[PDB]
Amino acid sequence: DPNFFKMVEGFFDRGASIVEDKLVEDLKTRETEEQKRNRVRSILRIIKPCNHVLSLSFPIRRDDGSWEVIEGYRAQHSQHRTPCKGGIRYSTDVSVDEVKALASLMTYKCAVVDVPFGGAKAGVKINPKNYTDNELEKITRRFTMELAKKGFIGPGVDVPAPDMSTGEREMSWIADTYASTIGHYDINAHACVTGKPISQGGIHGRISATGRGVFHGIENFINEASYMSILGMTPGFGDKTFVVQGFGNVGLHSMRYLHRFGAKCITVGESDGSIWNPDGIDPKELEDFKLQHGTILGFPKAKIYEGSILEVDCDILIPAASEKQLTKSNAPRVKAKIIAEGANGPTTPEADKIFLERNIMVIPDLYLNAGGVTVSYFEWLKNLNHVSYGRLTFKYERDSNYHLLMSVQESLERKFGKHGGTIPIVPTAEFQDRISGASEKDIVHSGLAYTMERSARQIMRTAMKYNLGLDLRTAAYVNAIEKVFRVYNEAGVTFT
Amino acid sequence: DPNFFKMVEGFFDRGASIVEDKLVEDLKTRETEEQKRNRVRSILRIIKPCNHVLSLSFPIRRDDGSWEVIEGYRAQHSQHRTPCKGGIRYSTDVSVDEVKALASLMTYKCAVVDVPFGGAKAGVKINPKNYTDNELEKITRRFTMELAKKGFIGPGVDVPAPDMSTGEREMSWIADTYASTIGHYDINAHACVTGKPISQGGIHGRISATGRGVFHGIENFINEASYMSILGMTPGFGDKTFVVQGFGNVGLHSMRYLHRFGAKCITVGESDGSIWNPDGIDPKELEDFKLQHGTILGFPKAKIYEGSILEVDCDILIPAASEKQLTKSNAPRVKAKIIAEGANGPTTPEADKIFLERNIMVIPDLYLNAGGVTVSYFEWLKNLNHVSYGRLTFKYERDSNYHLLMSVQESLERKFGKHGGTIPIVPTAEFQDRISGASEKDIVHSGLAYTMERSARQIMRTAMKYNLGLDLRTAAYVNAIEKVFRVYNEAGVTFT
Amino acid sequence: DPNFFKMVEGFFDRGASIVEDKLVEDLKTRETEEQKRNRVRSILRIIKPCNHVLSLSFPIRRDDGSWEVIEGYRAQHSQHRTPCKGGIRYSTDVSVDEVKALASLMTYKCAVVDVPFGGAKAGVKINPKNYTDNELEKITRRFTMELAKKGFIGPGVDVPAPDMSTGEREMSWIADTYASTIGHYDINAHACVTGKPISQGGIHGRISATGRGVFHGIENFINEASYMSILGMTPGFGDKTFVVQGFGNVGLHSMRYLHRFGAKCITVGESDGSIWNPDGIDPKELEDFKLQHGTILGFPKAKIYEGSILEVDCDILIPAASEKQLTKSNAPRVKAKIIAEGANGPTTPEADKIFLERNIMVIPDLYLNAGGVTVSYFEWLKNLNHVSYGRLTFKYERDSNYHLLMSVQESLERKFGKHGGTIPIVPTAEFQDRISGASEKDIVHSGLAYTMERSARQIMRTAMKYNLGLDLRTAAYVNAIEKVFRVYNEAGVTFT
């Protein structure tokens, strides 16, 4: 199993090698062909590595009164778009290479979904299970101070985000620390971090963001007859099964949104075991059973499945757990028609090459796992705007809709002759429910769906334009590299 | 031919002399009548001249290794609204008087279209044809640095713009230089300049901005029966001909948008000759013929017209070329019913006085040439917002429209008794095309049209309120002076 | 040969282990003995590692038009005193571990000479011999920009300095870049870097700074009878010989200043060979011979010495060349009574342990190589003051001295009875020369000598207080650790 750094390097190298010929041809400036070739190679060389990596060593005082030195890292991959964006991970396994690779991955993911952020990633080398709430808060605030002093945290410079190991309370601590010490005179101080709770400037709909993004990315390619023909399927969600690996937030919400639109789930596996029921599994039953039992084992409405969760006889495989689980050990045995990677880097390059032969579709995490990033961009915009979405427009649009219905009613009675005849003033039950429960999360989900659809169409266009098959990962990486190169080329690189 | 400085001074003097009587009467504060008269005279005296003019002399190193001293100027006319806005012109003919006059013109143009910018203008005394791309970039970056150090460039202070002689690449250089050296810690650094390419924070629809503004300003007065009666015409665009002077971006886009709405073009003239075809000229044919041939001469579908392009037997004359082309030499020979000035100051005051006698309508460049300024304001707002227009609302409004259509369908079947009867769920072909191709440029063009309509109505109201005839220039200048005086008076002038 | 990182770690560990018992005892606050022990251990643990390490990857455009990615690092060891201070090294061999070790060494060196700077070190992974002047300037300016954006360059944050591989022109480039882009609004922008040329705010006397510091550190221990007894010598500089390893700036100036005060040199060795003359070698002859011949080989007034320069039958060995040249391979053969380390880390710990047995004095580079740091502190102070030393006081003190002499003359004639008798108005030839040639370098050298004397006395006091013998390195490290601990303890560490 190659490391994520080498994986990202290989993906970028392949994408750049594919895209360079077009990058050279589209240049129409007053130089020679070989000068254009060298310029394109040079800009790619500039883009590939991380620009800034900061290693930190700061002290904290333990609860008992002892002192501990904490090691932390933050890598900013690209500054072609500011601010940089990236999560903070609290783990003993964090490393400079890992944070650099994840920062590069974030850079390329933001480009795919047209989010104007650079890539970043931070890691603190602690095990949070061995610290109290007070000590964790002290660590978070000291990390925030040290990063802010060196220009690695800021609303216009670098906006961190939560991870699996960090949460909304950590983001609250970061925002509170920045807004009160370093960014006190900055009106956008609370835009320095996303993933905040609602009372701290968070955005509505962030909880189901990644799951909804996974669902939208799945459905965009599901409703595509051109790819459905090669995969041997039918358009729509009918007669389709899916399984999820890991039942975290991403997997749970993806399962719920897939079950909503008519798809049925078969089995749900984790590291502590796996459930299995071919007739359909209810996401709410799984949710409340897990909420009570602390685990998924012992579900009375399903049974135990032997072997890995990746080899079930299903249609769509959705891994939302530990990464690099798809490799040559189990790649030729999965027998899953579509692979929907809800996690970052769950498929090795050799596994992907195997799936290419077997006509197996792999939807890259560059595109599918970008819903949370889009909603974080929306939250950052909301903090910049200092108002929630729809606050000044919901009642106005409601009045406009009522006026439109009234106009239709009067016109219908006036073509006729009536006073109380045809009544096209009644909105449908779904429309009335939408009107009554109109909130910021509706706008957020609408924007997320729009972003997912646009990105899917761009990826498809790139795939057909470069004669690519079912390897959507190559098309997505090519698209991201093209966008980043365009920004670099039309801006200039050196000011000296 | 009087200089543009004297022309602007005369326009302002006439407008102030007309508007002063009303400016005095509407004042309802606790002073005397003569004190009010003196206060109004005083505020007009304050408004008339430019506030700040900066003369620059900075060095560059040539490609061969020699050094050259570059002279540049930037004039900020008014600071009653910040930031100031104005273009940068690369020409040997630039001068302090010219940049001051153009800054004043920009101040008065922004007021007409309700754009909250002061007026500004910059000029660099070089001939860009005698420099390479590298040397031009060095000149642009050094000019940006020198202006930024003295508070003459900034998102909240002064936002430059392109001209005919400068372009999107120059704006890219300016934005890149400012965002990396002086405005590095400013979150709105890229709002320091407009006219940027799309990848650098530019706005969609800027290319056709001035042409669309010219078309909207023409159609606003075309659809006005009160003025059509005095001009002896019919409302609408039927049985109307137009010719353009110069086939630049402004003239080309104005011709295209006029041809779209049913108007027919007769002849297109430039400095290298003129084409002529009374039966109709196709803008796309002209566009691609010019793109291939580098000029307009030799068009197989039309013939040569002798004499100046300003004396054709047409209905609407649209000069979009060098200025001061309408003067006593050719004023009584033009025989064009309406003059639509798409360029800055193409008519001399004596020519305008001649057109007043001959019942010839002159639409001022203060109003007609303000589409680019409005779209630049939109681009500045987009940079401040850090998101493109419609990103969070397109899908939401699409869902709302579908729900409205569904409500109408169900209500129609329910007044009736049907399940699949009347089907008012189908949007029209034009509506469906608008829904499918909904983008930021649609919002930009909608805002531009709204601004043009509001400005046209305000100008008409001022014209009828001050007993003015077809001299819309006087009405527009009076309106701008009134707005600027209102801002000055309600704010106060001296803080000491 | 262990690496410099492990060497510094071992030196710090030994010093902390020696000093901890006293650090605990002198604490008189309201806690328990074991709490004091843990607090001291904890502060030492905080002090030991580097606080911030920044890894950079920035592009430059080559002269031929190609692009290259440059890797650079800057490590800030301690922020207990701001700004941090450290040199910039242009070499292919630079590494994160090396820059961290050198930053720690700088932290401990500044404490010894009471210079209020933290330690820092920067390295750029290029070979300057393979670049032109223009490319080197581009690299320097881009490095300055990248460091300044991340808070790693600044008059109050971090002040870089030259190295052997970087020079006054590089410091000029750094100062010019910072003062014009990021620190434009900072009145102390030119204090961001030291080692500048005179016309750029440099200080007089920097050239001979390190050599004069080496001479002063040597003479302080030479004039100490208490150590002279154990070494079996006589106080003064009579009947004393010295040899230098490497004839760089440090070695040349140390040789010149030692020859001035009556000491005689025997041989001068480098990597290209070695000269040898037991009867005395003239520093000016060596200087101009090297200036003409580009090397030291072929000196007509001396002969070739076989073997290493470290094993000559002399009294004082002064290495001013590559580091780690003293080790077990040649340690028991040197036969040099006193070792005066003018270079950073030229003696390995095993070599030092060997010299301890053989009653061989080793003067640490922590103290002896700190003259340049002191003069850099003086230059930083001069830039902050915006005036050269003595500008407002030289003439005043000259008038005061003349008045004192006149007072003595009149009093002598008035005790006597005379008008033109005793004439104590004539200053000596040396005093008159000092008065006539009074400049800033005299004040700089006076301050350097004062700093060296104070540091030597403090080191001696620590050595006798901790029962240390001739291992002055341990005493110096103990003194630096004590000072840093005092600052940390009396300030506090965590603000949370």
Per-position DSSP letters for B76-141, written without gaps between them: E---SSSSEEEEEEE-TT--HHHHHHHHHHHHHHHHHTT---EEEEEEE---GGGS-HHHHHHHHH
User: How do B264-270 and B241-245 pair as beta strands?
Assistant: parallel
Phi, psi of C169 (to 5 degrees): -70, -35
Q: Based on C-alpha coordinates, what's the Rg of chain B?
A: 25
Question: Would you say A169 and A88 are in contact if contact means Cβ atoms under 8 Å apart?
Answer: no
> What single-letter DSSP state applies at residue A130?
G
The reply to whether omega before C424 is within 30° of 0 (cis) is no
User: How far apart are the C-alpha atoms of A123 and A71, rounded to whole Å?
Assistant: 9
Distances (CA, A) of B80 to A3, B17, B24, B374: 60, 21, 20, 18
Q: Tell me whether residues A50 and C57 touch, CB distance under 8 A.
A: yes
Phi, psi of C160 (to 5 degrees): -70, 170
User: How do B84-90 and B118-124 pair as beta strands?
Assistant: parallel
Per DSSP, the three-state class of C162 is coil
Per DSSP, the three-state class of B62 is coil
Enumerate the H helices of A321-439 as residue ranges: 349-357, 365-368, 371-385, 394-415, 429-436
User: How far apart are the C-alpha atoms of A123 and A140, rounded to whole Å?
Assistant: 11
Q: If we measure between CA atoms, which residue out of C214, C258, C206 comes closest to residue C237?
A: C258
Contacts of A450 in chain B (CB under 8 A): 391-392, 394-395
Residue in chain B nearest C63 by alpha carbon = B63
> How close C154 comes to chain B (CA, Å)?
15
Chains with 3+ CB–CB pairs under 8 A to B are A, C
The reply to whether omega before B278 is within 30° of 0 (cis) is no
Q: What is the dihedral of CA C347, C348, C351, C357, to 10 degrees?
A: 90
> What single-letter DSSP state applies at residue C420?
S
Residue in this structure with the two tokens 């580098």, named with its chain if needed: B294
Residue in chain A nearest C177 by alpha carbon = A496
Question: Would you say A341 and A365 are in contact if contact means Cβ atoms under 8 Å apart?
Answer: yes
Contacts of B184 in chain C (CB under 8 A): 149, 182
Q: Which residues of A touch B (CB under 8 A)?
A: 29-30, 82, 116, 155-156, 188, 378, 381, 384-385, 389, 397, 401, 404-405, 408, 421-428, 430-431, 434, 442-444, 446-447, 449-451, 453, 483, 486-487, 490-492, 495
Q: Tell me whether residues A491 and B200 touch, CB distance under 8 A.
A: yes
Per DSSP, the three-state class of B339 is strand
Q: Is C462 exposed, middle or buried (0-12, 13-18, 19+ CB in 10 A)?
A: buried
Query: Would you please indicate which residues of C are annotated as catalytic (active-site) residues?
Result: 121
**Region for C321 from its dihedrals, namely left if φ exceeds 0, alpha if ψ lies in -120 to 50, beta otherwise:** beta
- Which residues have C-beta within 8 Å of that of residue B421, sequence separation ≥ 6? B412, B413
Tokens of B426: 């189908």
Q: Tell me whether residues A53 and C55 touch, CB distance under 8 A.
A: yes
Question: Would you say C220 and C472 are in contact if contact means Cβ atoms under 8 Å apart?
Answer: no
Per DSSP, the three-state class of A269 is strand
Per DSSP, the three-state class of C205 is coil
Element of type H or E holding C276: strand C273-276
> What single-letter DSSP state applies at residue A84?
E
Enumerate the H helices of C48-132 as residue ranges: 96-112
Per DSSP, the three-state class of A210 is helix
Q: Tell me whether residues C182 and B181 touch, CB distance under 8 A.
A: yes
Per DSSP, the three-state class of A54 is strand
One-character DSSP codes across B200-266: GT--TT-TTHHHHHHHHHHHHHHT-HHHHHHHT--SSSTT-EEEEES-SHHHHHHHHHHHHTT-EEE
Question: Would you say B12 and B478 are in contact if contact means Cβ atoms under 8 Å apart?
Answer: no
Picking from A54, A67, A496, the nearest residue to C42 by CB comes out as A67
Q: If we measure between CA atoms, which residue out of A263, A264, A271 comes closest to residue A245?
A: A271
Per DSSP, the three-state class of A90 is strand
Question: Would you say C476 and C35 are in contact if contact means Cβ atoms under 8 Å apart?
Answer: no
> B178-182 long-range CB contacts below 8 Å, 24 or more apart?
B178/B144, B178/B148, B178/B153, B178/B154, B179/A82, B180/A495, B180/C145, B180/C181, B181/A495, B181/B145, B181/B148, B181/C145, B181/C180, B181/C181, B181/C182, B182/B145, B182/B148, B182/B149, B182/C181, B182/C184
Kindly list the strands in the beta sheet with A303-304, ordered across the sheet, starting from the edge strand earlier in the chain.
Answer: A303-304, A273-276, A264-270, A241-245, A316-319, A338-340, A361-363
Q: Is B152 exposed, middle or buried (0-12, 13-18, 19+ CB in 10 A)?
A: buried
| Inter-chain CB pairs, B–C, below 8 Å | 13
User: How do C241-245 and C264-270 pair as beta strands?
Assistant: parallel
- The number of residues in chain A equals 496
Q: Tell me whether residues A57 and C42 touch, CB distance under 8 A.
A: no
Per DSSP, the three-state class of B400 is helix
Picking from A59, A137, A493, the nearest residue to C46 by CB comes out as A59
Per DSSP, the three-state class of C54 is strand
- Which residues have C-beta within 8 Å of that of residue C411, sequence separation ≥ 6? none
Distances (CA, A) of C77 to C104, C369, C481: 5, 19, 14
Question: Would you say A122 and A140 are in contact if contact means Cβ atoms under 8 Å apart?
Answer: no
Q: If we measure between CA atoms, which residue out of C408, C396, C390, C397 comes closest to residue C431?
A: C397
Q: Which amino acid is at A16?
A: A
CA angle, C51 as apex, C50 and C56 as ends, to 5°?
Answer: 90
The resolution in Å comes to 2.3
> How close C260 comes to chain A (CA, Å)?
47
- For C462, what's the count of Cα atoms within 13 Å in the CB-facing half-sphere? 24
> How close A75 comes to chain C (CA, Å)?
9
User: How far apart are the C-alpha atoms of A194 and A376, rounded to whole Å?
Assistant: 6
Per DSSP, the three-state class of A407 is helix
Tokens of B442: 């649609």
User: How far apart are the C-alpha atoms of A332 and A358, rounded to whole Å?
Assistant: 8
Residue in this structure with the two tokens 């153009």, named with its chain if needed: B102
Phi, psi of A317 (to 5 degrees): -105, 125
User: How far apart are the C-alpha atoms of B325 and B246, rounded to whole Å?
Assistant: 11
Phi, psi of A154 (to 5 degrees): 170, 150
User: How far apart are the C-alpha atoms of B378 and B375, rounded to whole Å?
Assistant: 5
- Which residues have C-beta within 8 Å of that of residue B457, sequence separation ≥ 6? B220
Tokens of C38: 């843990």
> How close C149 comes to chain B (CA, Å)?
8
Q: Tell me whether residues C67 and A493 touch, CB distance under 8 A.
A: yes
Q: What share of chain A is helix, strand, coil (3-state, %, to 5)?
A: 50, 15, 35
- Which residues have C-beta within 8 Å of that of residue B49, sequence separation ≥ 6? none
Q: If we measure between CA atoms, which residue out of B495, B491, B465 comes closest to residue B478?
A: B465
User: How far apart are the C-alpha atoms of B215 and B378, rounded to whole Å?
Assistant: 19
Chains with 3+ CB–CB pairs under 8 A to A are B, C
Distances (CA, A) of C221 to B47, B272, B438, C302, C447: 78, 91, 84, 30, 18
Q: Tell me whether residues B395 and A156 touch, CB distance under 8 A.
A: no
Sign of the dihedral defined by the CA atoms of residues B149, B154, B159, B161, in that order: positive
Contacts of A150 in chain C (CB under 8 A): 52, 54, 150-152
Per DSSP, the three-state class of A374 is helix
Residue in chain A nearest C58 by alpha carbon = A51
Element of type H or E holding C269: strand C264-270
User: How far apart are the C-alpha atoms of B450 and B442, rounded to whole Å?
Assistant: 12
Q: If we measure between CA atoms, which residue out of B410, B424, B10, B384 comes closest to residue B201?
A: B384
One-character DSSP codes across C370-399: THHHHHHHHHHHHHHHTS-TTTTTHHHHHH
Helices (H) and strands (E) in chain A, counts: 16, 12
Q: Which residues of B touch A (CB under 8 A)?
A: 133, 137, 141, 169, 172-173, 175-177, 179-181, 185-187, 197, 199-200, 385-387, 391-396, 399-400, 403-404, 406-408, 410-412, 414-415
Dmax (CA) of chain B = 88
- Which residues have C-beta within 8 Å of that of residue A129, sequence separation ≥ 6? none
- For C297, what's the count of Cα atoms within 13 Å in the CB-facing half-sphere? 4
Q: Tell me whether residues B187 and A431 touch, CB distance under 8 A.
A: no
Q: What is the dihedral of CA C84, C90, C93, C94, to 10 degrees?
A: 20
Per DSSP, the three-state class of C118 is strand
Residue in this structure with the two tokens 């930031």, named with its chain if needed: B83
Residue in chain C nearest A68 by alpha carbon = C42
Picking from A51, A149, A495, the nearest residue to C57 by CB comes out as A51
Of the residues B181, B182, B185, B186, the best mutation for testing chain C's interface (the one with the most C CB atoms within 10 Å of its CB) is B181
Phi, psi of B124 (to 5 degrees): -120, 125
Buried b (16+ CB within 10 A) or exposed e, A385-420: eeebbbeeebeebeeebeebbeebbeebbeeeeeee
Separation of CA A342 from chain center: 8
Distances (CA, A) of B75 to A228, A489, B87, C34, C55: 62, 32, 11, 72, 44
> What single-letter DSSP state applies at residue C237?
S
Determination technique for this PDB entry? cryo-EM
Residue in this structure with the two tokens 């909304």, named with its chain if needed: A168
Question: Would you say C19 and C31 are in contact if contact means Cβ atoms under 8 Å apart?
Answer: no
Tokens of A27: 């240049």
Distances (CA, A) of C204 to A283, B25, B435: 78, 73, 74
Q: Tell me whether residues A434 and B403 touch, CB distance under 8 A.
A: yes
Question: Would you say C108 and C121 are in contact if contact means Cβ atoms under 8 Å apart?
Answer: no
Residue in chain A nearest C153 by alpha carbon = A150
- Residue A224 neighbours by CB distance under 10 Å: 16
- Which residues have C-beta within 8 Å of that of residue B410, sequence separation ≥ 6? A426, A428
Q: Which amino acid is at A267?
A: T
- Which residues have C-beta within 8 Å of that of residue C74, sequence separation ≥ 6? C53, C54, C56, C86, C99, C120, C121, C122, C123, C147, C152, C158
- Which residues have C-beta within 8 Å of that of residue C41, sequence separation ≥ 6? C20
Residue in chain B nearest A117 by alpha carbon = B386
> How close B388 comes to chain C (CA, Å)?
28
Q: What is the dihedral of CA A312, A314, A318, A324, to 10 degrees?
A: 40
User: How far apart are the C-alpha atoms of B466 and B264, rounded to whole Å?
Assistant: 35
Q: Which amino acid is at B385?
A: N
Question: Would you say C481 and C240 are in contact if contact means Cβ atoms under 8 Å apart?
Answer: no
The reply to whether omega before A59 is within 30° of 0 (cis) is no
Distances (CA, A) of C450 to A21, B410, B464, C380, C407: 67, 97, 88, 18, 30
Picking from A423, A449, A450, the nearest residue to B415 by CB comes out as A423
User: How far apart are the C-alpha atoms of B225 and C58, rounded to whole Å?
Assistant: 65
User: How do B241-245 and B158-161 pair as beta strands?
Assistant: unpaired
Element of type H or E holding B407: helix B394-415
Separation of CA B362 from chain center: 16
Q: Tell me whether residues C150 and A54 touch, CB distance under 8 A.
A: yes
Strand ranges for A222-324 from DSSP E: 241-245, 264-270, 273-276, 303-304, 316-319
Residue in chain C nearest A69 by alpha carbon = C46
User: How far apart are the C-alpha atoms of C126 and C123, rounded to whole Å?
Assistant: 9
> A401-410 long-range CB contacts below 8 Å, 24 or more apart?
A401/A427, A401/A435, A401/B400, A401/B404, A404/B404, A405/B404, A405/B407, A405/B408, A408/B408
Element of type H or E holding C84: strand C84-90
C88, β-bridge pairs:
C122
Question: Would you say B155 and B191 are in contact if contact means Cβ atoms under 8 Å apart?
Answer: yes
Tokens of A372: 């949370």
One-character DSSP codes across C335-352: --SEEE--SSS-B-HHHH
User: How far apart are the C-alpha atoms of B177 and B160, rounded to whole Å?
Assistant: 13
Contacts of C107 in chain A (CB under 8 A): none
- Residue B92 neighbours by CB distance under 10 Å: 11
User: How far apart are the C-alpha atoms of A481 and A465, rounded to whole Å?
Assistant: 15
Question: Would you say A332 and A359 are in contact if contact means Cβ atoms under 8 Å apart?
Answer: no
- Residue B422 neighbours by CB distance under 10 Å: 14
Given the residues B121, B196, B337, B382, the one annotated as active site:
B121
